Coordinates of C-alpha atoms in Angstrom, one line a residue:
Chain A
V113 CA 94.2 132.4 81.6
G114 CA 94.1 136.2 81.7
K115 CA 96.3 137.8 79.0
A116 CA 99.5 136.2 77.7
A117 CA 101.3 135.3 74.5
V118 CA 104.0 133.0 73.0
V119 CA 107.3 134.1 71.5
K120 CA 109.7 131.8 69.6
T121 CA 113.3 133.0 69.4
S122 CA 115.5 132.7 66.3
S123 CA 117.7 130.3 68.3
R124 CA 115.1 127.6 68.1
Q125 CA 114.0 128.2 71.6
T126 CA 110.3 129.0 72.2
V127 CA 109.7 131.1 75.4
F128 CA 106.5 131.8 77.3
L129 CA 105.8 135.2 78.8
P130 CA 102.8 136.8 80.6
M131 CA 101.1 140.1 79.7
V132 CA 103.8 142.6 79.0
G133 CA 103.3 146.3 78.4
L134 CA 106.6 146.7 76.4
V135 CA 104.6 146.1 73.2
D136 CA 101.4 147.7 71.9
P137 CA 98.2 145.7 71.3
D138 CA 98.3 146.7 67.6
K139 CA 102.0 145.6 67.5
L140 CA 101.0 142.0 68.2
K141 CA 101.3 139.9 65.0
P142 CA 102.1 136.3 64.2
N143 CA 105.6 135.9 62.8
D144 CA 106.6 139.4 63.9
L145 CA 110.3 140.0 64.1
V146 CA 111.4 141.3 67.5
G147 CA 114.2 140.9 70.0
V148 CA 114.5 140.0 73.7
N149 CA 117.1 139.9 76.5
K150 CA 119.9 137.3 76.4
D151 CA 118.5 135.6 79.6
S152 CA 115.3 137.1 81.0
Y153 CA 113.8 137.1 77.4
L154 CA 111.9 140.4 77.5
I155 CA 111.0 142.3 74.3
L156 CA 113.1 145.4 74.0
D157 CA 114.1 146.3 70.4
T158 CA 111.4 145.3 67.9
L159 CA 112.9 144.2 64.5
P160 CA 111.3 145.5 61.3
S161 CA 109.0 143.6 59.0
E162 CA 109.9 141.3 56.1
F163 CA 110.8 138.0 57.7
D164 CA 113.9 136.2 56.3
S165 CA 115.6 138.1 53.4
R166 CA 114.6 140.7 50.9
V167 CA 114.6 140.0 47.2
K168 CA 117.8 138.0 47.4
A169 CA 119.6 140.0 44.7
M170 CA 119.2 143.8 44.2
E171 CA 120.3 146.7 42.0
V172 CA 119.3 150.1 43.2
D173 CA 119.2 153.1 40.8
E174 CA 117.2 156.2 41.4
Chain B
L49 CA 167.0 123.2 61.5
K50 CA 165.8 126.6 60.2
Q51 CA 162.2 126.3 61.6
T52 CA 163.6 125.4 65.0
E53 CA 165.2 128.8 65.5
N54 CA 162.6 130.7 63.5
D55 CA 160.0 130.2 66.2
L56 CA 162.4 131.7 68.7
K57 CA 161.8 135.2 67.3
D58 CA 158.3 134.3 66.3
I59 CA 157.0 133.2 69.7
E60 CA 158.4 136.4 71.1
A61 CA 156.7 138.2 68.3
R62 CA 153.5 136.1 68.8
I63 CA 152.8 138.3 71.8
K64 CA 153.3 141.3 69.5
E65 CA 150.9 139.5 67.2
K66 CA 148.7 139.0 70.2
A67 CA 148.9 142.8 70.9
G68 CA 146.6 143.3 68.0
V69 CA 144.4 140.6 69.4
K70 CA 144.5 142.4 72.8
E71 CA 142.0 144.9 71.3
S72 CA 139.2 142.3 71.6
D73 CA 139.9 139.4 73.9
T74 CA 136.3 138.2 74.1
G75 CA 135.0 135.1 72.3
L76 CA 138.4 133.3 72.2
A77 CA 139.9 133.9 68.7
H95 CA 139.4 139.1 54.3
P96 CA 137.7 136.0 52.8
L97 CA 134.5 134.9 54.5
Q98 CA 131.5 132.8 53.5
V99 CA 128.9 134.7 55.7
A100 CA 129.7 137.4 58.2
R101 CA 129.9 135.8 61.6
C102 CA 131.2 137.1 65.0
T103 CA 130.6 136.2 68.7
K104 CA 127.8 138.4 70.2
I105 CA 129.6 141.4 68.6
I106 CA 130.2 142.8 72.0
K107 CA 131.7 146.0 70.7
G108 CA 129.0 146.8 68.1
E141 CA 118.7 156.5 65.1
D142 CA 121.1 153.7 66.1
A143 CA 124.6 153.8 67.6
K144 CA 126.0 150.2 67.9
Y145 CA 125.6 147.8 65.0
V146 CA 125.3 144.0 65.6
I147 CA 124.3 141.7 62.7
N148 CA 125.0 138.0 62.3
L149 CA 123.5 135.4 59.9
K150 CA 123.8 131.8 61.0
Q151 CA 121.7 129.0 62.4
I152 CA 121.3 130.9 65.7
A153 CA 120.3 134.6 66.3
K154 CA 119.7 136.0 62.8
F155 CA 120.1 139.8 63.0
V156 CA 119.0 142.6 60.7
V157 CA 119.4 146.4 61.0
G158 CA 117.9 149.1 58.7
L159 CA 120.2 151.9 59.6
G160 CA 124.0 152.2 59.6
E161 CA 126.9 154.2 58.1
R162 CA 128.2 155.6 61.4
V163 CA 131.1 154.7 63.6
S164 CA 130.3 152.4 66.5
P165 CA 133.0 149.8 66.3
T166 CA 136.1 151.8 65.4
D167 CA 137.1 149.5 62.5
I168 CA 137.5 145.7 63.2
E169 CA 135.4 144.1 66.0
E170 CA 135.2 140.7 67.6
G171 CA 135.1 137.9 65.0
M172 CA 136.7 140.3 62.5
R173 CA 134.3 139.1 59.8
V174 CA 131.7 141.8 58.9
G175 CA 130.9 142.7 55.3
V176 CA 129.4 141.5 52.1
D177 CA 127.7 138.1 52.3
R178 CA 124.2 136.9 51.3
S179 CA 124.4 140.1 49.3
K180 CA 121.8 142.5 50.8
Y181 CA 124.3 143.3 53.5
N182 CA 126.8 146.1 53.4
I183 CA 129.0 147.3 56.3
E184 CA 131.3 149.9 54.6
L185 CA 132.1 152.9 56.7
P186 CA 134.5 151.0 59.4
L187 CA 137.2 149.7 56.9
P188 CA 135.3 146.7 55.7
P189 CA 136.5 143.2 54.8
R190 CA 133.7 143.0 52.2
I191 CA 133.2 141.5 48.8
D192 CA 135.8 138.8 49.5
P193 CA 135.9 135.3 47.9
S194 CA 134.0 132.7 50.0
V195 CA 134.6 129.0 50.1
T196 CA 134.8 127.9 46.5
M197 CA 137.0 126.3 43.8
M198 CA 139.1 128.8 41.8
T199 CA 141.9 128.0 39.4
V200 CA 144.5 130.8 39.5
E201 CA 147.9 130.4 37.9
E202 CA 150.8 132.7 37.0
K203 CA 152.6 133.4 33.8
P204 CA 150.9 131.1 31.2
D205 CA 153.9 131.2 28.9
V206 CA 153.2 130.2 25.3
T207 CA 155.3 131.1 22.3
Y208 CA 154.0 131.9 18.8
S209 CA 152.4 129.0 16.9
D210 CA 150.5 129.9 13.7
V211 CA 151.3 133.3 12.3
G212 CA 150.1 132.3 8.8
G213 CA 146.6 133.7 8.8
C214 CA 147.0 135.4 12.2
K215 CA 148.8 138.5 10.9
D216 CA 145.9 140.9 11.2
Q217 CA 143.9 138.3 13.2
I218 CA 146.1 138.7 16.3
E219 CA 145.8 142.4 15.9
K220 CA 142.1 142.1 16.6
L221 CA 143.0 140.2 19.8
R222 CA 145.5 143.0 20.7
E223 CA 142.7 145.6 20.2
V224 CA 140.8 143.8 23.0
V225 CA 143.2 143.8 26.0
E226 CA 146.3 145.6 25.0
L227 CA 144.5 148.5 23.3
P228 CA 142.8 150.1 26.4
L229 CA 146.1 149.6 28.3
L230 CA 148.0 151.9 25.9
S231 CA 146.0 155.0 24.7
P232 CA 142.7 155.2 26.5
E233 CA 142.3 158.8 25.4
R234 CA 141.3 157.8 21.9
Chain C
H67 CA 91.3 182.4 85.3
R68 CA 89.1 180.4 82.9
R69 CA 91.9 180.2 80.3
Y70 CA 93.8 177.6 82.4
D71 CA 90.6 175.7 83.3
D72 CA 90.5 174.0 80.0
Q73 CA 94.2 173.6 79.8
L74 CA 94.7 172.0 83.2
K75 CA 92.0 169.4 82.3
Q76 CA 94.1 168.6 79.3
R77 CA 97.2 168.4 81.5
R78 CA 95.5 165.9 83.8
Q79 CA 94.7 163.8 80.8
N80 CA 98.4 164.1 79.8
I81 CA 99.5 163.0 83.3
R82 CA 97.6 159.7 82.7
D83 CA 99.6 159.4 79.5
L84 CA 102.8 160.3 81.5
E85 CA 101.9 157.7 84.2
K86 CA 100.2 154.5 82.8
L87 CA 103.0 154.0 80.3
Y88 CA 105.9 153.1 82.5
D89 CA 103.6 151.4 85.0
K90 CA 103.6 148.3 82.8
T91 CA 107.4 148.5 82.6
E92 CA 107.8 148.5 86.4
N93 CA 106.3 145.0 86.6
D94 CA 109.0 143.8 84.3
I95 CA 111.7 145.3 86.6
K96 CA 110.5 143.1 89.5
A97 CA 110.1 140.2 87.0
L98 CA 113.9 139.7 86.8
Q99 CA 113.5 137.0 89.5
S100 CA 111.3 134.9 87.2
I101 CA 112.9 134.1 83.9
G102 CA 110.8 133.6 80.8
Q103 CA 109.8 130.0 80.7
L104 CA 110.5 127.7 77.8
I105 CA 108.1 125.4 75.8
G106 CA 107.0 122.0 77.0
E107 CA 104.3 119.4 76.5
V108 CA 103.3 116.4 78.6
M109 CA 104.2 113.1 76.8
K110 CA 103.7 110.1 79.0
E111 CA 102.9 109.7 82.7
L112 CA 105.9 108.3 84.7
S113 CA 105.8 109.1 88.5
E114 CA 102.9 110.3 90.6
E115 CA 103.2 114.0 89.8
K116 CA 106.3 114.5 87.7
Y117 CA 105.9 113.1 84.2
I118 CA 108.1 112.8 81.0
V119 CA 108.2 116.2 79.2
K120 CA 110.3 116.9 76.2
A121 CA 111.0 120.6 75.6
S122 CA 110.7 121.7 72.0
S123 CA 113.3 124.4 72.7
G124 CA 116.1 121.9 73.0
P125 CA 117.1 118.5 74.2
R126 CA 115.1 116.2 76.5
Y127 CA 114.7 117.7 80.0
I128 CA 112.4 116.2 82.6
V129 CA 111.5 119.1 85.0
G130 CA 109.8 119.2 88.4
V131 CA 106.2 120.0 89.3
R132 CA 104.4 122.5 91.5
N133 CA 101.3 122.1 93.7
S134 CA 99.6 125.3 92.3
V135 CA 97.9 123.1 89.7
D136 CA 96.5 119.6 89.7
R137 CA 96.9 116.6 87.4
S138 CA 93.5 117.0 85.6
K139 CA 95.0 119.3 83.0
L140 CA 98.5 117.7 83.2
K141 CA 97.5 114.8 80.9
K142 CA 99.1 114.2 77.5
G143 CA 98.7 116.6 74.6
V144 CA 98.7 120.0 76.4
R145 CA 101.2 122.8 76.6
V146 CA 102.9 123.3 80.0
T147 CA 105.2 125.9 81.6
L148 CA 108.8 124.8 82.5
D149 CA 111.4 126.9 84.2
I150 CA 114.9 127.3 82.7
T151 CA 116.9 127.2 86.0
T152 CA 114.7 125.6 88.8
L153 CA 113.3 123.2 86.2
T154 CA 109.8 122.8 87.5
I155 CA 106.2 123.2 86.1
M156 CA 104.9 126.6 87.1
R157 CA 101.3 126.7 85.7
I158 CA 99.1 125.1 83.0
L159 CA 98.8 127.3 79.9
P160 CA 96.2 126.4 77.2
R161 CA 97.4 124.4 74.2
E162 CA 98.8 126.7 71.6
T163 CA 98.9 125.7 67.9
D164 CA 101.2 128.8 67.0
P165 CA 98.7 130.5 64.6
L166 CA 101.4 131.8 62.3
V167 CA 100.7 133.3 58.8
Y168 CA 101.1 129.9 57.2
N169 CA 99.4 128.0 60.1
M170 CA 96.3 130.2 60.0
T171 CA 96.0 132.8 57.2
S172 CA 95.0 136.2 58.5
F173 CA 92.8 136.6 55.4
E174 CA 89.7 134.5 56.1
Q175 CA 86.6 133.9 53.8
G176 CA 86.4 137.1 51.7
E177 CA 85.0 140.6 51.4
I178 CA 83.6 139.7 47.9
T179 CA 80.0 138.9 46.8
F180 CA 79.0 135.8 44.9
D181 CA 80.8 134.2 42.0
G182 CA 82.1 136.7 39.4
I183 CA 84.0 133.8 37.8
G184 CA 80.9 131.6 38.1
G185 CA 77.6 131.2 36.2
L186 CA 77.6 127.4 35.9
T187 CA 74.6 126.3 38.0
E188 CA 75.1 122.5 37.8
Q189 CA 78.8 122.3 38.7
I190 CA 79.0 125.1 41.4
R191 CA 75.8 123.9 43.3
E192 CA 77.2 120.3 42.9
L193 CA 80.0 121.2 45.3
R194 CA 77.6 122.8 47.9
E195 CA 75.7 119.5 48.3
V196 CA 78.7 117.7 49.9
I197 CA 79.5 120.7 52.0
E198 CA 76.3 122.0 53.6
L199 CA 74.9 118.5 54.2
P200 CA 77.1 117.6 57.3
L201 CA 76.9 121.3 58.4
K202 CA 73.3 121.1 59.6
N203 CA 71.8 117.6 59.5
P204 CA 74.0 114.6 58.5
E205 CA 71.0 112.3 58.5
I206 CA 71.2 111.3 54.8
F207 CA 74.5 109.5 55.0
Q208 CA 73.3 107.6 58.1
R209 CA 70.5 105.7 56.2
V210 CA 72.9 105.2 53.3
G211 CA 75.7 104.1 55.6
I212 CA 78.6 105.8 53.9
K213 CA 81.3 108.2 55.0
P214 CA 80.8 111.8 54.0
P215 CA 82.6 112.6 50.7
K216 CA 85.4 115.2 51.0
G217 CA 86.5 114.8 47.4
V218 CA 86.9 118.0 45.3
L219 CA 89.2 118.2 42.3
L220 CA 89.9 121.1 40.0
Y221 CA 91.8 120.7 36.7
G222 CA 92.3 123.3 34.0
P223 CA 93.8 126.8 33.6
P224 CA 94.9 128.2 36.9
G225 CA 93.3 131.4 38.3
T226 CA 90.5 131.5 35.7
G227 CA 87.2 130.2 37.1
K228 CA 89.3 128.0 39.3
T229 CA 91.4 129.7 42.0
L230 CA 89.0 132.4 43.1
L231 CA 86.3 129.8 43.9
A232 CA 87.9 129.5 47.3
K233 CA 87.6 133.1 48.3
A234 CA 84.1 133.3 46.9
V235 CA 82.1 130.1 47.4
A236 CA 83.7 129.2 50.8
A237 CA 83.4 132.8 52.0
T238 CA 79.5 132.6 51.9
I239 CA 79.4 129.2 53.6
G240 CA 80.2 130.8 57.0
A241 CA 83.1 128.4 57.8
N242 CA 86.7 128.8 58.8
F243 CA 88.8 129.4 55.7
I244 CA 92.6 128.8 56.2
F245 CA 94.7 129.5 53.1
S246 CA 97.4 126.8 52.8
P247 CA 100.2 127.9 50.4
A248 CA 102.6 125.3 49.0
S249 CA 105.4 127.8 49.1
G250 CA 105.0 128.4 52.8
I251 CA 105.2 124.8 53.8
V252 CA 108.5 124.2 51.9
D253 CA 110.8 125.0 54.9
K254 CA 114.0 124.9 53.0
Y255 CA 116.1 124.3 56.1
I256 CA 115.1 121.2 58.1
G257 CA 111.7 121.0 56.6
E258 CA 108.8 120.5 59.0
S259 CA 106.4 120.3 56.0
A260 CA 103.4 118.1 56.6
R261 CA 104.0 118.2 60.3
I262 CA 102.9 121.8 60.1
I263 CA 99.6 120.8 58.5
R264 CA 99.0 118.3 61.3
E265 CA 99.0 121.1 63.8
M266 CA 96.4 122.9 61.6
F267 CA 93.7 120.1 62.1
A268 CA 93.5 121.1 65.7
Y269 CA 91.2 123.9 64.6
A270 CA 89.0 121.4 62.9
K271 CA 88.4 119.4 66.1
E272 CA 87.8 122.7 68.0
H273 CA 85.8 124.7 65.3
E274 CA 83.7 122.3 63.2
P275 CA 83.0 124.7 60.3
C276 CA 86.6 124.7 59.0
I277 CA 87.6 124.6 55.3
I278 CA 91.1 124.0 54.0
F279 CA 92.1 124.9 50.4
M280 CA 95.2 123.8 48.7
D281 CA 96.0 126.4 46.0
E282 CA 97.3 125.2 42.6
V283 CA 99.8 122.6 43.6
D284 CA 101.5 120.7 40.8
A285 CA 104.7 120.4 42.8
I286 CA 103.8 117.2 44.5
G287 CA 102.2 115.8 41.3
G288 CA 105.2 114.4 39.5
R289 CA 106.1 111.0 41.0
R290 CA 109.6 110.8 39.3
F291 CA 109.5 107.3 38.0
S292 CA 113.3 107.5 37.6
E293 CA 113.7 108.5 41.3
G294 CA 116.9 110.5 40.5
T295 CA 115.9 113.5 42.5
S296 CA 117.8 115.4 45.1
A297 CA 115.5 117.6 47.2
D298 CA 112.3 116.2 45.6
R299 CA 112.7 112.7 47.2
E300 CA 111.6 114.3 50.5
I301 CA 108.6 115.7 48.7
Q302 CA 107.1 112.3 47.8
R303 CA 108.1 111.4 51.4
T304 CA 106.3 114.3 53.1
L305 CA 103.3 113.7 50.9
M306 CA 102.7 110.4 52.6
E307 CA 101.9 112.2 55.8
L308 CA 99.2 114.2 54.0
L309 CA 97.7 110.9 52.8
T310 CA 97.4 109.8 56.5
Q311 CA 94.8 112.5 57.1
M312 CA 92.8 110.9 54.3
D313 CA 93.6 107.4 55.7
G314 CA 94.2 107.1 59.4
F315 CA 92.4 107.9 62.6
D316 CA 91.1 111.3 61.5
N317 CA 87.4 111.1 60.4
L318 CA 85.3 114.3 60.4
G319 CA 83.4 115.2 57.3
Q320 CA 83.8 119.0 58.0
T321 CA 87.2 119.8 56.6
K322 CA 86.9 119.6 52.8
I323 CA 89.7 118.3 50.5
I324 CA 90.4 120.6 47.6
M325 CA 93.5 120.2 45.4
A326 CA 94.2 121.9 42.1
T327 CA 96.6 121.1 39.3
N328 CA 97.5 122.5 35.9
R329 CA 97.7 119.3 33.8
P330 CA 96.6 115.5 34.2
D331 CA 100.2 114.4 34.0
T332 CA 102.0 111.8 36.1
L333 CA 100.1 113.0 39.2
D334 CA 100.0 110.5 42.0
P335 CA 97.0 108.1 41.5
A336 CA 96.7 107.3 45.2
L337 CA 95.4 110.7 46.0
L338 CA 93.1 110.4 43.0
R339 CA 91.2 107.6 44.6
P340 CA 87.4 107.9 44.1
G341 CA 87.1 108.1 47.9
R342 CA 89.7 110.9 48.2
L343 CA 88.7 113.0 45.2
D344 CA 85.1 112.9 44.0
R345 CA 83.8 116.1 42.3
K346 CA 85.9 116.9 39.3
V347 CA 85.1 120.4 38.0
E348 CA 86.4 121.1 34.5
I349 CA 86.9 124.6 33.2
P350 CA 85.2 124.5 29.8
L351 CA 84.1 127.2 27.3
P352 CA 80.3 127.3 28.0
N353 CA 77.6 129.2 26.1
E354 CA 76.0 132.5 27.0
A355 CA 74.1 130.8 29.9
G356 CA 77.4 130.1 31.6
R357 CA 79.0 133.5 31.1
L358 CA 75.8 135.5 31.6
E359 CA 76.2 136.1 35.3
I360 CA 79.8 137.2 34.6
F361 CA 78.7 139.9 32.1
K362 CA 76.3 141.4 34.7
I363 CA 79.1 142.1 37.1
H364 CA 81.3 143.0 34.2
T365 CA 78.6 145.6 33.2
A366 CA 78.0 147.1 36.6
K367 CA 81.7 148.0 37.0
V368 CA 82.0 150.0 33.7
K369 CA 80.0 153.2 33.6
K370 CA 79.1 153.9 30.0
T371 CA 76.2 154.7 27.8
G372 CA 72.9 152.9 28.3
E373 CA 72.8 151.5 24.7
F374 CA 74.7 148.2 24.3
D375 CA 74.2 144.8 22.8
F376 CA 76.3 142.0 24.4
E377 CA 74.4 139.1 22.7
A378 CA 76.6 139.5 19.6
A379 CA 79.7 139.6 21.7
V380 CA 78.9 136.1 23.1
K381 CA 79.5 134.5 19.6
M382 CA 82.7 136.6 19.4
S383 CA 84.1 134.7 22.4
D384 CA 86.6 132.0 21.4
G385 CA 88.9 130.5 24.0
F386 CA 87.9 133.2 26.5
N387 CA 87.5 132.7 30.2
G388 CA 86.5 134.7 33.3
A389 CA 89.9 136.5 33.2
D390 CA 89.6 137.2 29.4
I391 CA 86.2 138.8 30.0
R392 CA 87.8 141.4 32.3
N393 CA 90.3 142.0 29.5
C394 CA 87.5 143.2 27.2
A395 CA 86.6 146.4 29.0
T396 CA 90.2 146.7 30.2
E397 CA 91.6 147.2 26.8
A398 CA 88.5 148.9 25.4
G399 CA 88.6 151.4 28.3
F400 CA 92.2 152.2 27.5
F401 CA 91.1 153.7 24.1
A402 CA 88.8 156.1 25.9
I403 CA 91.4 157.4 28.4
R404 CA 92.8 160.1 26.0
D405 CA 89.2 160.7 24.7
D406 CA 88.3 162.4 28.1
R407 CA 85.2 160.2 28.4
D408 CA 84.3 157.1 30.3
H409 CA 81.7 155.9 27.8
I410 CA 82.5 152.7 25.9
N411 CA 80.8 152.1 22.6
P412 CA 79.5 148.6 21.9
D413 CA 81.7 148.4 18.8
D414 CA 84.7 149.6 20.7
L415 CA 84.2 146.9 23.3
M416 CA 84.0 144.2 20.5
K417 CA 87.3 145.5 19.1
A418 CA 89.1 144.4 22.3
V419 CA 87.2 141.1 22.2
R420 CA 88.9 140.3 18.9
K421 CA 92.2 141.5 20.2
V422 CA 92.3 138.9 23.0
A423 CA 91.7 136.2 20.4
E424 CA 94.9 137.1 18.6
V425 CA 97.1 137.0 21.7
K426 CA 95.7 133.6 22.8
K427 CA 98.1 130.9 23.7

């Protein structure tokens, strides 16, 4: 088994990857928004939190 | 046979219309439902690529700088879903999506009942016509 | 010469920080030859080695196999590893249930002590008899010859002596507690719904002490006798898969069935079966004996003078619950904020008791 994880893309394609040092052990979370390569599927730019949308309507005044 | 000879100068001008398309030739070939492009090849953070659809939902926290140099790829970037503002590169934003709108021109109607509407129409004129005359008051 | 001796040792520790970082990225540079494999599961045996596998990442693709593994773990109901290009089976990964936030809640059991909303000895202990019995020795139901009851029903005001029983009672049992929200299983776009919950029972077969708690769901209750719905016709449809767990092949006695509702309205009678739902815990307005254990925790939180009488405040309680008890010192403590003191007089606390009775309903 060793060390591995599972990542599901937003394209409805679930990909499998072995232990990868591109992410920190504290950064591993279920339903964590991230991004990968268009083919090799390697995590590069990690998207922020707050899955799906934010408070669908907003008015901001300081 | 007007349309027959109209395409003679139009097809020759279609290449001139294609000259504007020659900016981005990728992904084959302003009101929008949701902002959608193909891969947004053009695009702290420099390039900005965001798309909302059934595949590859994108989000970016930063912005307000020139990556694309105005329009890019699918030409549709701007207000949709709310929550989403691309402003800085000449946006096609806050534009009517697919919907049903009734818009006519010149609803011409003459006077009907002036009997009790003498000062009653004046109250209607103080609604629309009034700020269009002397807003300083 | 000794000034650099302590600094060079820190530099050598910095070199390790300047080395072991990119060392993990170099393995990914050589990993460009092997593309990240998709998802797959063995369905039915077809040929000798190669079997029928449908990839959940797209349409149906039957891939090849490799000799690095054998057919012992290649049987049905296990996750496999299938390549995108070569289309073979690389290795055998363990079966993954995708422990998402709604699949398995990160919050488990609780950090809280015994019931602060409790104090009813007969009803609370009545639930523990059908729980702790199969956990140790299930020898009582063998001589009786009956299936272990999973039935637990909660009806009354939500959140008051009702909701928090899950994070309190089930936290001290020492069993797996997976919070199952009704708003996380909606899946507005192509709803998986109850099929998500089916993947959750895999923890029950693995870990026996598992507890599932449905939190205040009136949404599936209305059966819509008119059947004029739009998006709610699928809800009565997805509910039938939940009934299968109480009906079909699954028989355990470990996972407990707890469903709460606000009102005994048109709620589906099938799930109300005396086999499916057994213990029905009402939320009444008991006497001092019921709310006595709440007042002790209510007293230990507030730091005030040592002279108080709470026996007269018990009679003052009308239509008050475990949440309304917290309101007592909450509003009474607000009067002492501008008084520059934390002491709460017994008459000042009773003033807030009457104040909750005015805002009732």
